């Protein structure tokens, strides 16, 4: 394999971390390939669930707990901490909240969160590499509680970073929030990528095409598929009671991706940096509820 940048995996990985049996588990947790037969039953369907009041309460709860776990990870970012150490803290924080860490064993993913440094677009595997001053790192969290999943991610700075890192991370966050500001009943899901790409391109960046936002509720990933690029062909119109994520990945160079031999780590083919932010959103009768928002502070961590 020819690496695309400076990063390499730092092996061995710790043996997989057990989740105590008193924590309720999603179907894939005990499937030997980590397949989710509930998701597979709906593959290629574009119908979108209208959540009940009971489902809305379930999603509000799990999303608030997921935000608490991301904030634990944010407090750990500093030069010299490994991504496996971050993951270990996340794993324990999920269990302390009586939640299952949804990434764990999802299609055999080996860890409890994804850690994506520099040229990693998404799905980086926590490993033995210490974070380095000047890095950018995304942590992507999802929790499962009482049958519901809640999903969010943020990019962080490691120590002092260069101006290009500042600009990339700021622009990516603005792309997410411009999309969110457009969510309300009657808006087509395909419009969100028109908004995201306009802002990225105005600042000299590109938009990843291979990975999209998604429906999330009783399933981790389901309809709607929510692309982040312009002129896409996503199916569907927003209605009050829909729940889904917006999770744009923006790049310094070109948008093309490739996957490492581990089958998960997605990297820019040119080796230049990428950043991402994500919320889980509920459409309301007039707009949206940001289920994974911070309740206690005005800004994402990189601004704080
Ligand atoms: Cl995801
Ligand atoms: Co993912
Ligand atoms: Co996520
Ligand atoms: Co997501
Ligand atoms: K990254």
Give residue limits of the domains in the chain: 1-304
The tokens for 215 are 């429906």
Q: Which ligand has the nearest atom to the CA of 245?
A: 4
Query: How far does the centroid of ligand 4 lie from the alpha carbon of residue 152, in Å?
Result: 7
User: Which residues have C-beta within 8 Å of that of residue 2, sequence separation ≥ 6?
Assistant: none
* Cα 197 from Cα 248, distance rounded (Å): 9
Number of Cβ within a 10 Å radius of residue 125: 25
Annotated binding site: 123, 140, 151, 214, 221, 247, 278
All residues with CB under 5 Å from ion ligand 4:
151, 245, 247
**Mutual angle of helices 83-96 and 53-74, in 10-degree steps:** 140
CA–centroid distance, residue 224 to ligand 2 (Å) = 15
- Which of the 8 DSSP states describes residue 205? -
CA dist., res. 59 & res. 144, Å (int): 10
**133 within 8 A of 79, measured Cβ to Cβ:** yes
Q: Radius of gyration of the chain from Cα atoms?
A: 18
Q: How far apart (Å, rounded) are the C-alpha atoms in residues 259 and 253? A: 17
How far apart are the CA of 4 and the centre of ligand 1, in A?
23
Q: How many angstroms separate the alpha carbon of residue 141 from the centre of ligand 1?
A: 8
For residue 80, with 0-12 CB atoms within 10 Å meaning exposed, 13-18 middle and 19 or more buried, which class applies? exposed
Q: Given in angstroms, what resolution was this structure solved at?
A: 1.1
Distance of alpha carbon 256 from alpha carbon 208, whole angstroms? 7
Any idea what DSSP says for residue 137? E
As beta bridge partners, residue 138 has: 116, 155
Q: Write out the CATH class of domain 1-304.
A: alpha beta
| Rounded-to-integer distance, Cα 71 and Cα 62, Å | 14
Task: List binding-site positions for Zn(2+).
Answer: 140, 151, 214, 247, 278
Joined together, the tokens standing for residue 304 give 């704080």
Residue with tokens 């600042």: 203
In the chain, the N- to C-terminal Cα span, in Å, equals 39
């Amino acid at each position: 394999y020819r690496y695309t940048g400076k990063l390499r995996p730092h092996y061995p990985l710790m043996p997989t971390r057990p989740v105590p049996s008193y924590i309720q588990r999603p179907d894939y947790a005990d499937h030997p390939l980590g397949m989710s037969e509930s998701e597979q039953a709906l593959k290629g369907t574009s119908q979108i669930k209208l959540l009940s009041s009971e489902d809305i309460e379930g999603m509000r709860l799990v999303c608030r707990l997921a935000r608490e776990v991301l904030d634990v990870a944010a407090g750990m970012i500093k030069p010299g901490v490994t991504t496996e150490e971050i993951d270990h803290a996340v794993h324990l924080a999920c269990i302390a909240r009586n939640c299952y860490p949804s990434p764990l064993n999802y299609y055999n993913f080996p860890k409890s969160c994804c850690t994506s440094v520099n040229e990693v677009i998404c799905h980086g595997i926590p490993d033995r590499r210490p974070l380095q001053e000047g890095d950018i790192v995304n942590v992507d969290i999802t929790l499962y509680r009482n049958g519901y999943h809640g999903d969010l991610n943020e990019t962080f700075f490691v120590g002092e970073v260069d101006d290009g890192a500042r600009k990339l991370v700021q622009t990516t966050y603005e792309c997410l929030m411009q999309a969110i500001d457009a969510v309300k009943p009657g808006v087509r899901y395909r419009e969100l990528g028109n908004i995201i790409q306009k802002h990225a391109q105005a600042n000299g960046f590109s938009v990843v095409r291979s990975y999209c936002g998604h429906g999330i509720h009783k399933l981790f990933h389901t309809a709607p598929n929510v692309p982040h690029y312009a002129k896409n062909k996503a199916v569907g119109v927003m209605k009050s009671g829909h729940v889904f994520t917006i999770e744009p990945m923006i790049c310094e160079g070109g948008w093309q991706d490739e996957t490492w031999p581990d089958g998960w780590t997605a990297v820019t083919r040119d080796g230049k940096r990428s950043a991402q932010f994500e919320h889980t959103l509920l459409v309301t009768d007039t707009g949206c509820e940001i289920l994974t928002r911070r309740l206690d502070s005005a800004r994402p961590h990189f601004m704080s």
